[PDB]
């Protein structure tokens, strides 16, 4: 379904996920809402990735324990428990950035993405070529 160029990083430590599009860090709020913020001091932008299989990851909130997940209509939400909607295909893009494709909706190329105004971009609205889908992992 998709290429297998993988980013060089590892999951030994937590990370921030910075989106170059509008310059926002991906954030999972306590109530389950997902968006982005420019505030680097926010306690809900610290994430921990873990590999379930090579190239497949969970992305979780270190502050709340919630898992990033994409639902059946393509909206991101914070899940309390790991489910099929929480697995993402982590891949290199433009020889530099990390992208995250919904495993469950991989055939439709639904990505994790932030718009320029900081709101999450719905799965079917994302696609290869956009800046909304490009992330750079940064240290906490």
From Swiss-Prot:
Mutagenesis / variant outcome for changing residue 98 to A: No effect on integrin-binding. No effect on integrin- and heparin-binding, loss of FGFR1-binding, defective in inducing FGF1 signaling, cell proliferation and cell migration
SUPFAM superfamilies: Cytokine (SSF50353)
Gene Ontology process terms (BP): activation of protein kinase B activity; anatomical structure morphogenesis; angiogenesis; branch elongation involved in ureteric bud branching; cellular response to heat; epithelial cell proliferation; fibroblast growth factor receptor signaling pathway; lung development
GO terms for cellular component: cell cortex; cytoplasm; cytosol; extracellular matrix; extracellular region; extracellular space; nucleoplasm; nucleus
Keyword line: Acetylation, Angiogenesis, Cytoplasm, Developmental protein, Differentiation, Growth factor, Heparin-binding, Mitogen, Nucleus, Phosphoprotein, Secreted
Modification after translation, per record: In the nucleus, phosphorylated by PKC/PRKCD.
Domain of life: Eukaryota
Span list, region Heparin-binding: 115-131
InterPro entries found in the cross-reference section: Fibroblast_GF_fam (IPR002209), IL1/FGF (IPR008996)
PROSITE patterns the UniProt entry points to: HBGF_FGF
Localization per record: Secreted; Cytoplasm; Cytoplasm, Cell cortex; Cytoplasm, Cytosol
Known partners and oligomeric status: Monomer. Homodimer. Interacts with FGFR1, FGFR2, FGFR3 and FGFR4. Affinity between fibroblast growth factors (FGFs) and their receptors is increased by heparan sulfate glycosaminoglycans that function as coreceptors. Found in a complex with FGFBP1, FGF1 and FGF2. Interacts with FGFBP1. Part of a Cu(2+)-dependent multiprotein aggregate containing FGF1, S100A13 and SYT1. Interacts with SYT1. Interacts with S100A13. Interacts with LRRC59. Interacts with CSNKA, CSNKB and FIBP. While binding with LRRC59, CSNKA and FIBP seem mutually exclusive, CSNKB and FIBP may cooperatively interact with FGF1.
Family in the record: Belongs to the heparin-binding growth factors family.
Function recorded in the entry: Plays an important role in the regulation of cell survival, cell division, angiogenesis, cell differentiation and cell migration. Functions as a potent mitogen in vitro. Acts as a ligand for FGFR1 and integrins. Binds to FGFR1 in the presence of heparin leading to FGFR1 dimerization and activation via sequential autophosphorylation on tyrosine residues which act as docking sites for interacting proteins, leading to the activation of several signaling cascades. Binds to integrin ITGAV:ITGB3.
Protein name in the entry: Fibroblast growth factor 1
Species whose genome carries this gene: Homo sapiens
Gene name of this polypeptide: FGF1
